[PDB]
Protein backbone atom coordinates (compact mmCIF):
# COMPACT_ATOMS: atom_id res chain seq x y z
CA UNK A 1 0.00 0.00 0.00
CA UNK A 2 1.40 3.33 1.16
CA UNK A 3 5.16 3.72 1.69
CA UNK A 4 7.61 6.06 3.43
CA UNK A 5 11.26 7.06 3.60
CA UNK A 6 12.71 8.42 6.84
CA UNK A 7 16.12 9.57 8.03
CA UNK A 8 16.81 9.65 11.78
CA UNK A 9 19.65 11.67 13.30
CA UNK A 10 20.88 11.52 16.89
CA UNK A 11 23.55 13.84 18.28
CA UNK A 12 24.65 13.52 21.91
CA UNK A 13 27.19 15.80 23.60
CA UNK A 14 29.80 13.79 25.52
CA UNK A 15 31.34 15.77 28.45
CA UNK A 16 34.00 13.11 29.16
CA UNK A 17 35.06 12.56 25.53
CA UNK A 18 36.83 14.64 22.85
CA UNK A 19 33.90 14.52 20.43
CA UNK A 20 30.09 14.29 20.59
CA UNK A 21 28.35 11.16 19.24
CA UNK A 22 26.43 11.25 15.95
CA UNK A 23 24.30 8.46 14.46
CA UNK A 24 22.31 8.62 11.23
CA UNK A 25 19.99 5.88 9.95
CA UNK A 26 17.87 5.55 6.82
CA UNK A 27 14.59 3.63 6.74
CA UNK A 28 12.24 2.63 3.95
CA UNK A 29 8.99 1.71 5.65
CA UNK A 30 10.21 -0.54 8.49
CA UNK A 31 13.47 -1.72 6.86
CA UNK A 32 16.70 0.13 7.65
CA UNK A 33 18.96 0.55 4.61
CA UNK A 34 21.80 2.93 5.53
CA UNK A 35 23.80 3.89 8.62
CA UNK A 36 26.50 6.31 9.71
CA UNK A 37 28.28 6.32 13.07
CA UNK A 38 30.84 9.02 13.94
CA UNK A 39 32.64 6.58 16.26
CA UNK A 40 32.98 3.76 13.69
CA UNK A 41 36.26 3.08 11.85
CA UNK A 42 35.07 3.54 8.25
CA UNK A 43 33.81 7.16 8.48
CA UNK A 44 31.45 6.41 5.58
CA UNK A 45 27.76 5.79 4.95
CA UNK A 46 27.25 2.02 5.25
CA UNK A 47 24.72 -0.35 3.58
CA UNK A 48 22.22 -2.15 5.87
CA UNK A 49 19.85 -3.64 3.30
CA UNK A 50 20.59 -6.05 0.41
CA UNK A 51 18.88 -3.83 -2.19
CA UNK A 52 20.90 -0.66 -1.52
CA UNK A 53 24.07 -2.62 -2.46
CA UNK A 54 23.33 -2.24 -6.18
CA UNK A 55 23.97 1.53 -5.98
CA UNK A 56 27.35 2.60 -7.40
CA UNK A 57 30.47 4.38 -6.00
CA UNK A 58 29.07 7.88 -6.68
CA UNK A 59 26.01 7.21 -4.49
CA UNK A 60 28.19 6.11 -1.56
CA UNK A 61 30.61 9.06 -1.95
CA UNK A 62 27.59 11.38 -2.23
CA UNK A 63 25.84 10.00 0.86
CA UNK A 64 29.14 10.01 2.80
CA UNK A 65 29.96 13.70 2.14
CA UNK A 66 26.34 14.66 2.85
CA UNK A 67 26.00 12.73 6.14
CA UNK A 68 29.36 14.12 7.32
CA UNK A 69 28.01 17.64 6.69
CA UNK A 70 24.89 16.66 8.69
CA UNK A 71 27.24 15.40 11.43
CA UNK A 72 29.21 18.67 11.56
CA UNK A 73 26.02 20.76 11.49
CA UNK A 74 24.42 18.83 14.38
CA UNK A 75 27.70 19.06 16.31
CA UNK A 76 27.51 22.87 16.08
CA UNK A 77 23.77 22.69 16.90
CA UNK A 78 24.59 21.21 20.33
CA UNK A 79 26.72 24.28 21.15
CA UNK A 80 24.07 26.63 19.76
CA UNK A 81 21.24 25.23 21.92
CA UNK A 82 23.52 25.20 24.98
CA UNK A 83 23.85 28.97 24.45
CA UNK A 84 20.13 29.46 23.71
CA UNK A 85 19.04 27.91 27.03
CA UNK A 86 22.08 29.23 28.97
CA UNK A 87 23.25 25.73 29.95
CA UNK A 88 26.75 24.76 31.13
CA UNK A 89 29.21 22.43 29.37
CA UNK A 90 29.16 19.91 32.25
CA UNK A 91 25.95 18.14 31.19
CA UNK A 92 25.08 15.82 28.31
CA UNK A 93 22.35 16.89 25.88
CA UNK A 94 20.58 15.26 22.92
CA UNK A 95 19.62 16.73 19.56
CA UNK A 96 17.29 14.56 17.48
CA UNK A 97 16.24 15.17 13.89
CA UNK A 98 13.85 13.36 11.57
CA UNK A 99 12.87 14.06 7.98
CA UNK A 100 11.23 12.21 5.10
CA UNK A 101 8.23 11.72 2.86
CA UNK A 102 5.14 9.52 2.56
CA UNK A 103 3.61 8.20 -0.66
CA UNK A 104 0.17 6.66 -1.25
CA UNK A 105 -0.42 3.28 -2.91
CA UNK A 106 -0.22 5.11 -6.26
CA UNK A 107 3.31 6.16 -5.15
CA UNK A 108 2.52 9.89 -5.20
CA UNK A 109 3.49 12.35 -2.45
CA UNK A 110 1.15 12.50 0.56
CA UNK A 111 3.05 14.06 3.48
CA UNK A 112 6.50 15.43 4.28
CA UNK A 113 8.26 15.74 7.63
CA UNK A 114 11.13 17.82 9.07
CA UNK A 115 11.39 18.12 12.85
CA UNK A 116 13.74 18.50 15.82
CA UNK A 117 13.83 17.63 19.50
CA UNK A 118 16.19 18.89 22.18
CA UNK A 119 16.37 16.62 25.26
CA UNK A 120 13.29 14.65 24.16
CA UNK A 121 11.12 17.73 23.66
CA UNK A 122 9.66 19.15 20.44
CA UNK A 123 11.83 22.03 19.27
CA UNK A 124 10.85 22.94 15.70
CA UNK A 125 8.70 21.21 13.07
CA UNK A 126 7.58 21.79 9.49
CA UNK A 127 3.77 21.87 9.15
CA UNK A 128 1.80 19.74 6.64
CA UNK A 129 1.33 22.74 4.29
CA UNK A 130 5.16 22.56 3.97
CA UNK A 131 5.52 26.35 4.19
CA UNK A 132 5.22 26.93 7.93
CA UNK A 133 7.22 26.27 11.12
CA UNK A 134 6.00 25.23 14.55
CA UNK A 135 8.46 26.71 17.04
CA UNK A 136 7.77 25.65 20.64
CA UNK A 137 9.63 28.35 22.60
CA UNK A 138 11.64 31.58 22.22
CA UNK A 139 14.84 29.65 21.43
CA UNK A 140 13.16 27.91 18.48
CA UNK A 141 11.95 31.32 17.28
CA UNK A 142 15.61 32.27 16.76
CA UNK A 143 16.04 29.15 14.59
CA UNK A 144 12.81 29.96 12.74
CA UNK A 145 14.02 33.48 11.88
CA UNK A 146 17.31 32.11 10.50
CA UNK A 147 15.43 29.66 8.27
CA UNK A 148 12.82 32.13 6.96
CA UNK A 149 15.67 34.42 5.87
CA UNK A 150 17.32 31.54 3.98
CA UNK A 151 13.96 30.30 2.60
CA UNK A 152 14.59 26.82 4.06
CA UNK A 153 10.95 25.62 3.83
CA UNK A 154 10.79 26.32 0.08
CA UNK A 155 14.03 24.37 -0.45
CA UNK A 156 12.81 21.55 1.79
CA UNK A 157 9.55 21.31 -0.17
CA UNK A 158 11.68 20.75 -3.28
CA UNK A 159 13.43 17.82 -1.58
CA UNK A 160 10.37 16.26 0.11
CA UNK A 161 8.13 16.46 -2.98
CA UNK A 162 10.93 15.84 -5.49
CA UNK A 163 14.18 14.10 -4.53
CA UNK A 164 12.69 12.29 -1.49
CA UNK A 165 9.78 10.80 -3.46
CA UNK A 166 11.94 9.96 -6.52
CA UNK A 167 14.56 8.08 -4.49
CA UNK A 168 11.85 6.32 -2.44
CA UNK A 169 10.28 4.94 -5.66
CA UNK A 170 13.74 3.91 -6.89
CA UNK A 171 14.40 1.97 -3.65
CA UNK A 172 10.91 0.41 -3.70
CA UNK A 173 11.70 -1.02 -7.15
CA UNK A 174 15.27 -2.21 -6.47
CA UNK A 175 14.07 -3.97 -3.31
CA UNK A 176 10.76 -5.15 -4.80
CA UNK A 177 10.94 -8.65 -3.26
CA UNK A 178 11.53 -7.22 0.24
CA UNK A 179 9.74 -3.85 0.34
CA UNK A 180 6.63 -4.70 -1.70
CA UNK A 181 5.85 -8.03 0.00
CA UNK A 182 3.02 -8.49 2.49
CA UNK A 183 3.25 -11.20 5.17
CA UNK A 184 0.06 -12.16 7.00
CA UNK A 185 0.29 -12.70 10.78
CA UNK A 186 0.43 -16.24 12.10
CA UNK A 187 -1.95 -16.08 15.07
CA UNK A 188 -2.65 -18.16 18.18
CA UNK A 189 -3.99 -17.70 21.72
CA UNK A 190 -2.54 -18.79 25.07
CA UNK A 191 -4.16 -19.23 28.49
CA UNK A 192 -2.66 -18.75 31.96
CA UNK A 193 -4.29 -18.93 35.40
CA UNK A 194 -3.06 -15.98 37.47
CA UNK A 195 -5.27 -16.75 40.49
CA UNK A 196 -8.19 -19.04 41.42
CA UNK A 197 -10.69 -16.50 40.03
CA UNK A 198 -8.67 -14.79 37.26
CA UNK A 199 -7.01 -15.90 34.01
CA UNK A 200 -4.81 -14.30 31.34
CA UNK A 201 -5.64 -14.67 27.65
CA UNK A 202 -2.81 -13.65 25.33
CA UNK A 203 -3.43 -13.02 21.63
CA UNK A 204 -0.33 -13.50 19.46
CA UNK A 205 0.59 -12.08 16.06
CA UNK A 206 3.81 -13.49 14.59
CA UNK A 207 5.88 -13.31 11.37
CA UNK A 208 4.04 -10.35 9.82
CA UNK A 209 5.20 -7.57 7.47
CA UNK A 210 4.87 -4.60 7.47
CA UNK A 211 4.94 -3.62 11.17
CA UNK A 212 1.49 -1.96 11.11
CA UNK A 213 -1.09 -4.09 12.95
CA UNK A 214 -4.19 -3.65 15.14
CA UNK A 215 -4.82 -6.15 17.95
CA UNK A 216 -8.00 -5.43 19.91
CA UNK A 217 -9.90 -7.33 22.59
CA UNK A 218 -13.68 -7.44 22.80
CA UNK A 219 -15.99 -8.53 25.62
CA UNK A 220 -19.40 -9.61 24.25
CA UNK A 221 -18.64 -8.01 20.86
CA UNK A 222 -17.71 -4.77 22.63
CA UNK A 223 -14.29 -3.07 22.61
CA UNK A 224 -12.22 -3.71 25.74
CA UNK A 225 -9.15 -1.68 26.72
CA UNK A 226 -10.05 -1.34 30.43
CA UNK A 227 -7.88 -4.37 31.32
CA UNK A 228 -5.80 -4.80 28.14
CA UNK A 229 -2.00 -5.08 28.12
CA UNK A 230 -0.38 -4.23 24.78
CA UNK A 231 3.34 -4.62 24.07
CA UNK A 232 5.16 -2.50 21.48
CA UNK A 233 5.53 -4.13 18.05
CA UNK A 234 8.94 -5.81 18.11
CA UNK A 235 11.27 -7.00 15.34
CA UNK A 236 11.88 -10.74 15.03
CA UNK A 237 15.28 -9.99 13.47
CA UNK A 238 14.58 -11.64 10.11
CA UNK A 239 12.57 -8.76 8.59
CA UNK A 240 9.27 -9.76 10.19
CA UNK A 241 7.55 -8.35 13.28
CA UNK A 242 5.80 -9.61 16.41
CA UNK A 243 3.13 -8.30 18.80
CA UNK A 244 0.78 -9.61 21.49
CA UNK A 245 -2.21 -8.36 23.47
CA UNK A 246 -3.46 -9.80 26.77
CA UNK A 247 -6.54 -9.44 28.98
CA UNK A 248 -7.10 -10.55 32.58
CA UNK A 249 -10.48 -12.31 32.56
CA UNK A 250 -12.60 -13.94 35.30
CA UNK A 251 -12.16 -17.73 35.33
CA UNK A 252 -14.95 -19.54 33.47
CA UNK A 253 -15.55 -16.47 31.29
CA UNK A 254 -12.75 -17.06 28.75
CA UNK A 255 -15.14 -17.68 25.82
CA UNK A 256 -16.88 -14.30 26.28
CA UNK A 257 -13.72 -12.61 24.94
CA UNK A 258 -12.55 -12.25 21.34
CA UNK A 259 -9.28 -11.00 19.83
CA UNK A 260 -9.42 -9.12 16.53
CA UNK A 261 -6.41 -9.03 14.20
CA UNK A 262 -6.20 -6.35 11.50
CA UNK A 263 -3.38 -6.48 8.93
CA UNK A 264 -2.72 -5.60 5.26
CA UNK A 265 -1.66 -9.14 4.25
CA UNK A 266 -4.92 -10.44 5.69
CA UNK A 267 -7.81 -10.80 3.18
CA UNK A 268 -10.33 -10.51 6.03
CA UNK A 269 -9.89 -9.47 9.69
CA UNK A 270 -9.49 -12.49 11.99
CA UNK A 271 -11.58 -13.12 15.09
CA UNK A 272 -10.06 -15.45 17.69
CA UNK A 273 -11.84 -17.08 20.64
CA UNK A 274 -10.37 -19.38 23.30
CA UNK A 275 -11.29 -23.05 22.81
CA UNK B 1 19.19 9.80 -0.66
CA UNK B 2 19.94 12.52 1.91
CA UNK B 3 19.14 16.21 1.54
CA UNK B 4 22.06 18.26 0.16
CA UNK B 5 21.27 21.47 2.04
CA UNK B 6 22.38 21.68 5.67
CA UNK B 7 20.48 24.26 7.79
CA UNK B 8 21.63 25.15 11.33
CA UNK B 9 19.68 25.73 14.55
Amino acid at each position, epitope marked *: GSHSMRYFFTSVSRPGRGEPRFIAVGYVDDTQFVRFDSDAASQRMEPRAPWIEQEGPEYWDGETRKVK*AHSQTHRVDLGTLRGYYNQSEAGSHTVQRMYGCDVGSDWRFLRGYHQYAYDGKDYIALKEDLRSWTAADMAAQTTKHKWEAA*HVA*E*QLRAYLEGACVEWLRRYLENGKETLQRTDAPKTHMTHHAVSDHEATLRCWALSFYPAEITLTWQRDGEDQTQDTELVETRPAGDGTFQKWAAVVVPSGQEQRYTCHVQHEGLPKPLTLRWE | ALW*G*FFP*VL
Partner: T-cell receptor
Amino acid sequence: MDSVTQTEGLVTLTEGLPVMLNCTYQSTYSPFLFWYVQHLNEAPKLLLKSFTDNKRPEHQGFHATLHKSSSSFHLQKSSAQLSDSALYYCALFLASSSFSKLVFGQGTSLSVVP
Amino acid sequence: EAAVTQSPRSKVAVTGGKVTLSCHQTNNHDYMYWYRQDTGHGLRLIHYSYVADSTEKGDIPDGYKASRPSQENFSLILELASLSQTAVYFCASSDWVSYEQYFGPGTRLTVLE
Protein backbone atom coordinates in the same frame (compact mmCIF):
# COMPACT_ATOMS: atom_id res chain seq x y z
CA MET C 1 21.29 17.46 -17.15
CA ASP C 2 21.42 20.43 -14.76
CA SER C 3 22.74 23.45 -16.66
CA VAL C 4 22.49 27.20 -17.36
CA THR C 5 22.40 29.05 -20.71
CA GLN C 6 23.10 32.81 -20.90
CA THR C 7 23.12 35.42 -23.67
CA GLU C 8 26.32 34.86 -25.66
CA GLY C 9 29.12 37.43 -25.71
CA LEU C 10 28.81 41.21 -25.35
CA VAL C 11 25.58 43.16 -24.95
CA THR C 12 25.99 46.84 -25.83
CA LEU C 13 23.30 49.25 -24.65
CA THR C 14 22.73 53.02 -24.56
CA GLU C 15 22.24 54.68 -21.16
CA GLY C 16 18.57 55.20 -20.29
CA LEU C 17 17.37 52.08 -22.11
CA PRO C 18 16.05 48.84 -20.46
CA VAL C 19 18.37 45.93 -19.65
CA MET C 20 17.39 42.43 -20.83
CA LEU C 21 19.88 39.61 -20.19
CA ASN C 22 18.61 36.11 -20.91
CA CYS C 23 18.97 33.08 -18.66
CA THR C 24 17.42 29.66 -19.27
CA TYR C 25 18.09 26.43 -17.38
CA GLN C 26 17.50 22.70 -17.11
CA SER C 27 16.62 21.51 -13.61
CA THR C 28 15.75 18.02 -12.37
CA TYR C 29 13.99 19.38 -9.27
CA SER C 30 12.24 22.61 -8.21
CA PRO C 31 14.68 25.36 -9.40
CA PHE C 32 16.52 28.01 -7.38
CA LEU C 33 18.47 30.58 -9.40
CA PHE C 34 20.75 33.50 -8.61
CA TRP C 35 22.35 36.44 -10.41
CA TYR C 36 25.97 37.30 -9.67
CA VAL C 37 27.81 40.43 -10.79
CA GLN C 38 31.50 41.12 -11.36
CA HIS C 39 32.68 44.66 -12.08
CA LEU C 40 36.07 45.19 -13.76
CA ASN C 41 39.01 44.32 -11.47
CA GLU C 42 36.59 43.29 -8.71
CA ALA C 43 35.27 40.10 -7.09
CA PRO C 44 31.97 38.50 -8.15
CA LYS C 45 29.22 39.34 -5.62
CA LEU C 46 25.58 38.22 -5.22
CA LEU C 47 23.05 40.50 -6.90
CA LEU C 48 19.62 38.83 -6.59
CA LYS C 49 17.70 35.61 -5.78
CA SER C 50 14.81 33.69 -7.39
CA PHE C 51 12.97 33.37 -4.04
CA THR C 52 9.55 34.86 -3.22
CA ASP C 53 6.66 33.32 -3.38
CA ASN C 54 5.24 33.95 -6.92
CA LYS C 55 8.22 34.91 -9.23
CA ARG C 56 9.45 38.49 -8.66
CA PRO C 57 12.32 40.60 -7.19
CA GLU C 58 15.55 41.24 -5.24
CA HIS C 59 18.73 43.65 -5.56
CA GLN C 60 18.97 47.46 -6.90
CA GLY C 61 17.22 48.78 -10.01
CA PHE C 62 17.79 45.22 -11.23
CA HIS C 63 15.05 42.61 -10.92
CA ALA C 64 14.42 39.11 -12.28
CA THR C 65 11.25 37.02 -12.53
CA LEU C 66 11.35 33.22 -12.53
CA HIS C 67 9.09 31.56 -15.08
CA LYS C 68 9.28 27.86 -14.22
CA SER C 69 7.04 26.88 -17.17
CA SER C 70 9.57 27.98 -19.81
CA SER C 71 12.54 27.80 -17.40
CA SER C 72 13.46 31.50 -17.58
CA PHE C 73 15.25 33.83 -15.15
CA HIS C 74 16.11 36.90 -17.22
CA LEU C 75 17.84 39.91 -15.66
CA GLN C 76 15.92 43.16 -16.16
CA LYS C 77 16.22 46.86 -15.35
CA SER C 78 14.12 49.88 -16.40
CA SER C 79 16.91 52.37 -17.15
CA ALA C 80 20.55 51.38 -17.67
CA GLN C 81 23.32 53.59 -16.28
CA LEU C 82 27.05 53.67 -17.16
CA SER C 83 28.00 52.15 -13.79
CA ASP C 84 25.95 49.04 -14.71
CA SER C 85 28.72 48.04 -17.14
CA ALA C 86 29.82 44.69 -15.69
CA LEU C 87 29.92 40.91 -16.15
CA TYR C 88 26.73 39.14 -15.09
CA TYR C 89 26.48 35.49 -14.03
CA CYS C 90 23.25 33.52 -13.88
CA ALA C 91 23.60 30.58 -11.46
CA LEU C 92 21.73 27.35 -10.64
CA PHE C 93 21.78 26.09 -7.03
CA LEU C 94 21.76 22.28 -6.81
CA ALA C 95 21.15 21.00 -3.26
CA SER C 96 18.23 18.52 -3.43
CA SER C 97 19.87 15.09 -3.90
CA SER C 98 23.47 16.32 -4.14
CA PHE C 99 25.83 18.47 -2.06
CA SER C 100 25.07 22.21 -2.21
CA LYS C 101 26.72 23.75 -5.28
CA LEU C 102 26.19 26.76 -7.53
CA VAL C 103 26.34 26.02 -11.26
CA PHE C 104 27.30 29.26 -13.05
CA GLY C 105 26.67 30.06 -16.71
CA GLN C 106 29.30 31.55 -19.03
CA GLY C 107 28.34 35.09 -18.01
CA THR C 108 27.14 37.97 -20.19
CA SER C 109 29.25 41.13 -20.47
CA LEU C 110 27.16 44.30 -20.37
CA SER C 111 28.50 47.49 -21.93
CA VAL C 112 26.48 50.62 -21.22
CA VAL C 113 27.44 53.44 -23.60
CA PRO C 114 26.76 57.20 -23.17
CA GLU D 1 31.85 42.59 6.58
CA ALA D 2 32.51 39.09 5.21
CA ALA D 3 35.87 39.24 3.41
CA VAL D 4 38.07 36.77 1.55
CA THR D 5 41.74 37.34 0.68
CA GLN D 6 43.93 35.52 -1.88
CA SER D 7 47.70 35.18 -2.40
CA PRO D 8 49.45 35.71 -4.69
CA ARG D 9 47.52 38.19 -6.84
CA SER D 10 49.72 37.33 -9.84
CA LYS D 11 51.86 34.33 -10.79
CA VAL D 12 53.99 33.43 -13.81
CA ALA D 13 54.81 29.72 -13.93
CA VAL D 14 56.68 27.23 -16.14
CA THR D 15 55.13 24.03 -17.54
CA GLY D 16 55.89 21.13 -15.19
CA GLY D 17 56.42 23.43 -12.20
CA LYS D 18 54.63 23.57 -8.84
CA VAL D 19 52.10 26.33 -8.11
CA THR D 20 50.42 26.92 -4.73
CA LEU D 21 47.51 29.36 -4.52
CA SER D 22 46.52 30.43 -1.01
CA CYS D 23 43.21 31.66 0.38
CA HIS D 24 42.42 33.20 3.77
CA GLN D 25 39.08 33.95 5.40
CA THR D 26 38.06 34.97 8.95
CA ASN D 27 34.26 35.02 8.54
CA ASN D 28 33.85 31.84 10.60
CA HIS D 29 32.70 30.05 7.43
CA ASP D 30 32.97 26.27 7.22
CA TYR D 31 32.46 26.13 3.44
CA MET D 32 35.20 27.19 1.00
CA TYR D 33 35.49 26.90 -2.80
CA TRP D 34 37.96 27.31 -5.68
CA TYR D 35 36.74 28.52 -9.08
CA ARG D 36 38.52 29.28 -12.34
CA GLN D 37 37.48 31.95 -14.85
CA ASP D 38 38.44 31.74 -18.53
CA THR D 39 38.92 34.82 -20.77
CA GLY D 40 36.44 36.88 -18.70
CA HIS D 41 33.82 34.12 -18.88
CA GLY D 42 32.68 31.07 -16.91
CA LEU D 43 33.10 30.15 -13.26
CA ARG D 44 33.87 26.44 -12.90
CA LEU D 45 34.28 24.70 -9.53
CA ILE D 46 37.58 22.85 -9.07
CA HIS D 47 37.54 21.77 -5.41
CA TYR D 48 35.49 22.57 -2.31
CA SER D 49 35.57 22.00 1.46
CA TYR D 50 32.92 21.95 4.22
CA VAL D 51 35.28 21.19 7.13
CA ALA D 52 38.96 21.55 8.11
CA ASP D 53 41.26 18.64 7.10
CA SER D 54 38.89 17.41 4.36
CA THR D 55 38.47 18.35 0.68
CA GLU D 56 35.95 17.40 -2.03
CA LYS D 57 36.30 17.27 -5.83
CA GLY D 58 34.42 19.86 -7.88
CA ASP D 59 33.31 19.84 -11.51
CA ILE D 60 36.84 20.01 -12.96
CA PRO D 61 39.38 18.53 -10.47
CA ASP D 62 41.98 17.06 -12.91
CA GLY D 63 45.51 18.45 -12.47
CA TYR D 64 44.54 20.23 -9.25
CA LYS D 65 44.80 19.20 -5.61
CA ALA D 66 43.43 21.08 -2.61
CA SER D 67 44.28 21.36 1.09
CA ARG D 68 42.25 22.74 4.01
CA PRO D 69 44.71 22.85 6.97
CA SER D 70 42.29 24.94 9.08
CA GLN D 71 38.87 26.65 8.92
CA GLU D 72 40.58 29.86 7.77
CA ASN D 73 42.88 28.51 5.03
CA PHE D 74 42.24 26.77 1.69
CA SER D 75 45.10 25.98 -0.70
CA LEU D 76 44.96 25.15 -4.41
CA ILE D 77 47.89 23.03 -5.61
CA LEU D 78 49.12 22.44 -9.16
CA GLU D 79 51.83 19.75 -9.01
CA LEU D 80 52.76 19.82 -12.70
CA ALA D 81 51.54 23.06 -14.29
CA SER D 82 50.22 22.96 -17.86
CA LEU D 83 49.34 25.61 -20.47
CA SER D 84 45.65 24.72 -20.04
CA GLN D 85 45.79 26.01 -16.44
CA THR D 86 46.30 29.65 -17.52
CA ALA D 87 43.30 31.46 -16.00
CA VAL D 88 41.95 33.68 -13.24
CA TYR D 89 41.35 31.75 -10.00
CA PHE D 90 38.75 32.84 -7.45
CA CYS D 91 38.44 31.61 -3.89
CA ALA D 92 35.04 31.81 -2.20
CA SER D 93 33.52 31.18 1.24
CA SER D 94 30.04 30.71 2.69
CA ASP D 95 28.21 29.49 5.77
CA TRP D 96 25.30 27.00 5.59
CA VAL D 97 23.46 29.48 3.32
CA SER D 98 25.78 28.28 0.55
CA TYR D 99 24.09 30.19 -2.26
CA GLU D 100 25.47 33.39 -0.74
CA GLN D 101 29.13 32.89 -1.58
CA TYR D 102 31.73 35.57 -0.89
CA PHE D 103 34.57 35.77 -3.39
CA GLY D 104 38.25 36.69 -3.06
CA PRO D 105 39.94 39.30 -5.29
CA GLY D 106 41.23 36.70 -7.78
CA THR D 107 44.59 35.30 -8.90
CA ARG D 108 45.90 35.81 -12.43
CA LEU D 109 48.02 32.81 -13.36
CA THR D 110 49.82 32.34 -16.67
CA VAL D 111 51.71 29.12 -17.42
CA LEU D 112 54.45 29.25 -20.07
CA GLU D 113 56.64 26.68 -21.87
